[PDB]
Amino acid sequence: DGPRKLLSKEEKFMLNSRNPDLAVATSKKWLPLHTLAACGEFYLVDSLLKHNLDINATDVGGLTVLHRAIIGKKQAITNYLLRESANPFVLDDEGATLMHYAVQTASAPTIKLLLLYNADINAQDRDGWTPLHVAVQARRSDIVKLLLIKGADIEVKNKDGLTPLGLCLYLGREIRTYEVMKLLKEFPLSRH
């Protein structure tokens, strides 16, 4: 139409192409699949994945499209990715699992979803932190409770020798911190 006349023959040929040239659209830091997922473009994510794309490809920091969908709480995209056999067991550059990320961002639906896909709820990163350690750090009683209900082990220690309760003792005396401590001390007793 208008601006199309401003294009060279080579550029017009690109515009009319039936398949994307993804090499142009990609860098080590910004992967088009990751970007589309991170900003919530579900239909476009699905379109890209219908071409020749590694669904498990990593950015310069070792994260996959699943990390990006999870961190941004893009729930439908996260479900879709797993449904399309994205690898749920990927680790980041410090040995943390997707569950660690789902917990940090306080996403109960993703936590549940990851468990259905056989996530180890007690997995430790390089520093020995479990998802429960992260939930405690977040002071999110709702998330802590969910993890406990789903069988998280309160006795797992990080490299400093701290259980999630132990970690709680260092977080600072404050109401939200007390509520988590109470959950941690009381929950095992509610098991018969």
Added chain:
Amino acid sequence: TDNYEEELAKEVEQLLEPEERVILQQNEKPNLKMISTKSWKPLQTLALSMQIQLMDNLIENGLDIDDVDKDNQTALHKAIIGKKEAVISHLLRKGANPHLQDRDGAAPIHYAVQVGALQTVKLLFKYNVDVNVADNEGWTPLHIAVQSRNRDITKILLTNGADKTRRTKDGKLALDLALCFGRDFKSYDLVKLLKIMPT
């Protein structure tokens, strides 16, 4: 009525072992070294879990609001990556530096564009961020906006001084990113914006 706090504090202490009690009383304020690791920075975690008051407590007790992690990211970077917009605006009002580039040369504006946070983008303009900041590979926010196929954000960057003749390290214009997807990716609309805007 913070008698609830004293009541709750007592309830919890009654549950603790003597050894746990000693540690608790020794740590009225958060113990930074004990509660932080490589992957899990308290400000970042609290930001992503929407714990604004707890963030303020950490900061007011001496933790730098622009404290960086292993990837030179601050809580602001992470809050944006998580698209936690109420936390983002809180941090900015508290004086979080919106100009800082992380390890990959990425600024808050880069990430706000990547997660498609239009309101955060508009807010960053008000703090006079450099909208043409280039990362380690020469990518600007305009490049990422076009990659995300977002017409609104592409347009607003151009209206606010985004440079459409800035090339990545391997010579790509935002125009190239618009064209390369071919049909059915809003490519023509993006090209049109890039050929006409601004003015």
